[PDB]
Amino acid sequence: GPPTSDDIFEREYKYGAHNYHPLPVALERGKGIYLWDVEGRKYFDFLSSYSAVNQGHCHPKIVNALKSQVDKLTLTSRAFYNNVLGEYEEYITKLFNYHKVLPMNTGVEAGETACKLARKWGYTVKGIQKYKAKIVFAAGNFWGRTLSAISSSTDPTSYDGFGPFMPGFDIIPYNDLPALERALQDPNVAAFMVEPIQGEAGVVVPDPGYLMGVRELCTRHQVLFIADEIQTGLARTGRWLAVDYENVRPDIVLLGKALSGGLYPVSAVLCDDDIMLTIKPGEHGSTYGGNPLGCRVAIAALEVLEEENLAENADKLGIILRNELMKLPSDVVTAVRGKGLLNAIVIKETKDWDAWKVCLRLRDNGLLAKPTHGDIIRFAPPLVIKEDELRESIEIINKTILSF
Amino acid sequence: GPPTSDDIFEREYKYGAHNYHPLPVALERGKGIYLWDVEGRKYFDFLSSYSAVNQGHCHPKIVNALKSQVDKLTLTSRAFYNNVLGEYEEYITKLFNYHKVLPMNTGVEAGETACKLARKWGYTVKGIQKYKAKIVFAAGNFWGRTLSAISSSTDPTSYDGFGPFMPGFDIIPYNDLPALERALQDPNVAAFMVEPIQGEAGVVVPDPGYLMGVRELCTRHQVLFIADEIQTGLARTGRWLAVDYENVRPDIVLLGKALSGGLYPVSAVLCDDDIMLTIKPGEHGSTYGGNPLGCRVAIAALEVLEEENLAENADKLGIILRNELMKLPSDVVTAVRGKGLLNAIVIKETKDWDAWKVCLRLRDNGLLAKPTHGDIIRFAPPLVIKEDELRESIEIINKTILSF
Amino acid sequence: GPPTSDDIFEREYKYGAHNYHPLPVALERGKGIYLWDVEGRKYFDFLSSYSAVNQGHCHPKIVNALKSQVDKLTLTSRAFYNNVLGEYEEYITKLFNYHKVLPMNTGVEAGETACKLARKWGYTVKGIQKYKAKIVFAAGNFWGRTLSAISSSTDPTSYDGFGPFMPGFDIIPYNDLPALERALQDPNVAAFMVEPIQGEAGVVVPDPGYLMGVRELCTRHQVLFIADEIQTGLARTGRWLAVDYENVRPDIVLLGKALSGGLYPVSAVLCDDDIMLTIKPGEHGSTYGGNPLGCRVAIAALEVLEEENLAENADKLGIILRNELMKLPSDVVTAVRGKGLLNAIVIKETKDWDAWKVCLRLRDNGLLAKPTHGDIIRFAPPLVIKEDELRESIEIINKTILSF
Numbered sequence A, B, C: 001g002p003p004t005s006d007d008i009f010e011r012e013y014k015y016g017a018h019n020y021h022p023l024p025v026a027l028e029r030g031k032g033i034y035l036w037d038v039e040g041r042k043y044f045d046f047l048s049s050y051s052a053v054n055q056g057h058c059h060p061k062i063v064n065a066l067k068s069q070v071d072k073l074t075l076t077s078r079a080f081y082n083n084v085l086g087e088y089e090e091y092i093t094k095l096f097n098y099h100k101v102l103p104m105n106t107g108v109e110a111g112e113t114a115c116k117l118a119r120k121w122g123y124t125v126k127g128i129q130k131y132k133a134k135i136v137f138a139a140g141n142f143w144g145r146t147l148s149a150i151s152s153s154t155d156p157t158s159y160d161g162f163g164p165f166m167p168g169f170d171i172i173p174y175n176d177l178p179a180l181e182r183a184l185q186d187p188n189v190a191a192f193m194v195e196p197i198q199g200e201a202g203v204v205v206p207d208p209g210y211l212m213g214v215r216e217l218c219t220r221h222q223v224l225f226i227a228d229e230i231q232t233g234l235a236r237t238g239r240w241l242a243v244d245y246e247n248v249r250p251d252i253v254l255l256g257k258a259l260s261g262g263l264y265p266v267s268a269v270l271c272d273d274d275i276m277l278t279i280k281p282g283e284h285g286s287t288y289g290g291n292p293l294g295c296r297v298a299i300a301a302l303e304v305l306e307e308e309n310l311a312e313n314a315d316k317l318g319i320i321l322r323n324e325l326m327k328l329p330s331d332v333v334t335a336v337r338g339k340g341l342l343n344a345i346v347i348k349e350t351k352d353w354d355a356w357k358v359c360l361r362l363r364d365n366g367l368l369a370k371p372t373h374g375d376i377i378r379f380a381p382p383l384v385i386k387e388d389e390l391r392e393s394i395e396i397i398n399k400t401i402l403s404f
């Protein structure tokens, strides 16, 4: 016979590392906003694979781009040229209005690249003494799991037991302009890296004006403003980039996750020549970075966001979701927050009943969501969701929450 | 009409970062051992995308695996289970005979994961005080371009201008057992990471017994032996792992590149429970790591290496390649080295005549290869190459060298 | 006639700096737990002047000490000796079991003194190069308003507009042992300064085991543990020192506020000879520090705490206070916290309901308390309060909270 859910759980427990704490559900198919488990049950996806399937699971446009290119050429490395990478480079730099892009594969690779750019520019353009360059981060940041990434983390689960840590990384509170201003008094700071909304920290939305103040302080003190839009970008919050809400232009922009619609690990580092060209030939790279397959996929994934106006849809539907969640009782759900279709609720955790239990019952009533910590549940469905489907989801959430 | 090669060169110059020094050739199609440029000209591929397309370009069996799964489900994240990952996990662990695998995407991610395991094991099992754990590396190593990876580099091009560097990374000479022994006298050393053959260093083959000696020293001093087989593994050197030549079993094995036949960025960290399970749920991850699309690709890629006996082929044909290369005048080609189909020659570089110029002319004659520095040319065709094809290539190599 | 409350407010507004936001009430008399305003109204004191009047207002024994000594001698400076200081020094050092005490006047002065001790010890004993020594602080710390003190603050109200700031001060989260452990990897760290309970942050009580973990980590990495007990000490939390709950011995202890029963500004720095004697004659001082009048007061104030077993009372009555407070509706009072008689509640602040408005009404109902931000009210009565008086006070709080 074919494996049950319990069979699948057991096999991974035996042959796979235990580095995740998954919700016990076993999926075999996805399409648009929906996932199906091996028992044939249907679920609303309200995680979107950490906002990587903004376009919905298996979008036909993106699938067709992948199938078309895989027959021709998939990997040359950048030791040679191919005919696709330049077409993608011209498309994406003109779309976001930066001189250049440096292609990578995963989100954390984009972040590492940005740190290297910041340091290189710091030493060769700004003139910092080697090797005294600093990069400032905000408390609660998440940008991956390399040794460098977790060195900037304030979450012990991320860094405990994995030191000694990368020097030159400082931390200030998020959503705190006086703290940024105090930090940038040090001329050895080369960059401030920040998420326009902190995702994995629990959808922490900064106050109106924060990003304007950030852009202002970074310009004033000759510091690069690095915007990590790997989770918040690409229509998820209701705009091409979440920084578009305050119409601010960062020095470096990071994209990933939804850049491929979930079909291929593609990430990108966008910035102007004065920054980008501090890195000379041979001084940075990646084997699969910029490969023609990922590029065809990324072009299609970006075109989907545009053609279907998913940003406008996320903006419209997000406020409906938040407004409805705000009707839940003040002492079962203690906060609602988000922008566009990146949202979260905080539940009054008891030692009897918590976010994990809510999510188990959400699963049972046909909706997949994951907690982060033990009192916050994230709601992030694919951006192709329609209003009637959203309202059905909302009913499921009401039903579940009010059932405890 | 279509863009020319020069068009392609110019577009990337304008819109892409300048972090590579590519051979001036623009490819648009690849099949088996062959690549075609946009002018229609045909080439032998003797780089194999740094040994990522061992199975040849666009291998029909791996391509079908990609095409089959892309319509079903491509990314859940490991927040949920799917039906594919566990099947891959059981397969690859049993193939290399380790308890568990931890799935990642790129080679440098696999290395970072191994360093994190080494440290976590160092503190929680070996009892090193936090955070005093050291990892030893060999001079000439290349394992990627994160801040941590270049912190272990002895190549200025990799690390200059990118500091400050990761602490706890110590460097010793390659192919030097006394040096290793002295380093392992420090009880705070958690691991030694090393390539069985150094790839980007210029195909540097250590003396017979080196790997056996490393294994013995690591076991004696309770140090983890991390073998980086991201380039040497998967039949490229004539065995499943280069480490198999001396019957050595590393504590952690890293795989990447050809694990997907070039269709998808897939890498793996293999080790037993005592090491793997030092990392608890939530303590390490990656958005695309272990996704079902890459898993189906990897399973197919591994099956191809087995079914077509590519390791055996690489062994036999490698012998021919080195034998025929060694016929070149001592005057002109000062060294020939390699195992299996991972090979290189060293030319007596004059002020006028260098490896780049040779490769430019090899291109002109229908064969693509990349130099390492001024005096080393690597030869690494896909492992599906046939003897007649190989000898045709050898002729091309011969006439090119002698034409200077 | 005599000045009204309104007269008093308007006079200070005209001739005094506007650096405070006081509760509009004008006191003229104080005795034990009670205060009377100029209109004759009587109030419970639930601020205890930031815990400086633990012994109650105008304690007869402390007053008698003042009156007795003021007729004899009040100030010689420490350029000469007097007959009182040595007696106080022996008394307090034997009481807390440290070799020596250094006498100062205000809390922030004791803190400055401890930072100088730590640095001096760092350079002359630990061997840190001048001037590379660091001191680590916990976010949320409050220890005064000198340029140095606000340089370690994470509260913009304290530091904004007052820089540039003192270098060599680093900040980590409170109640976070992994973060402390990470910070102490730097051998240039000389000390960690921390409150056993953060007072002005809103009575933030760390997890059980925190103080033990700090002591252990500081010892392990040769770092001084400075315990700021200026608010938490002297029976307020139900022990002589709040660190006594975990049987922890800091390297340096800071005392102040209630050290004088509110009659005189007296502070003290306690530590052993290997630390204290790093400061040589002429290298630190204060005009009024260690004056005979303050010393007589201090001895009396310390005797009151002991002879009336006020720590025992604080512990017993604080248990009662927190138990009764937790009976308030979980939807209006969202948290209750504290130790002994240092306590606070968190309210569910709305746009129209806040901590300030609550304290205004408490005042109207005969109880004086201070808010923290918009959602915290501190409750800290003098330790001489009796159970029946506490219970009466509690009904005022009940009446007030429920009345909204």
Ligand SMILES: *[C@@H](c1c(COP(=O)(O)O)cnc(C)c1O)[C@@H]1C[C@H](C(=O)O)CC1=N
Binding pocket: A050, A106, A107, A108, A109, A111, A142, A143, A144, A145, A195, A199, A200, A228, A229, A230, A231, A232, A256, A257, B285, B286, B287, B288
């Ligand atoms: C994903 C994430 C990254 C890292 O992306 P990657 O998983 O492809 O390497 C970078 N930046 C942002 C803003 C992200 O959201 C996050 C990271 C988080 C973690 O660090 O555990 C889990 C994610 N989904």
Ligand SMILES: *[C@@H](c1c(COP(=O)(O)O)cnc(C)c1O)[C@@H]1C[C@H](C(=O)O)CC1=N
Binding pocket: A285, A286, A287, A288, B050, B106, B107, B108, B109, B111, B142, B143, B144, B145, B195, B199, B200, B228, B229, B230, B231, B232, B256, B257
């Ligand atoms: C590829 C390589 C890596 C890194 O793999 P990645 O490019 O997918 O991240 C790790 N280990 C080995 C043995 C490799 O060969 C090398 C790294 C080298 C570099 O550092 O620039 C270039 C490569 N092709």
Ligand SMILES: *[C@@H](c1c(COP(=O)(O)O)cnc(C)c1O)[C@@H]1C[C@H](C(=O)O)CC1=N
Binding pocket: C050, C106, C107, C108, C109, C111, C142, C143, C144, C145, C195, C199, C200, C228, C229, C230, C231, C232, C256, C257
């Ligand atoms: C009082 C306080 C100090 C400073 O004492 P001082 O006012 O006599 O100089 C030092 N340490 C602790 C633990 C204290 O509680 C606090 C400081 C706070 C502030 O910084 O504004 C207000 C106080 N009452």
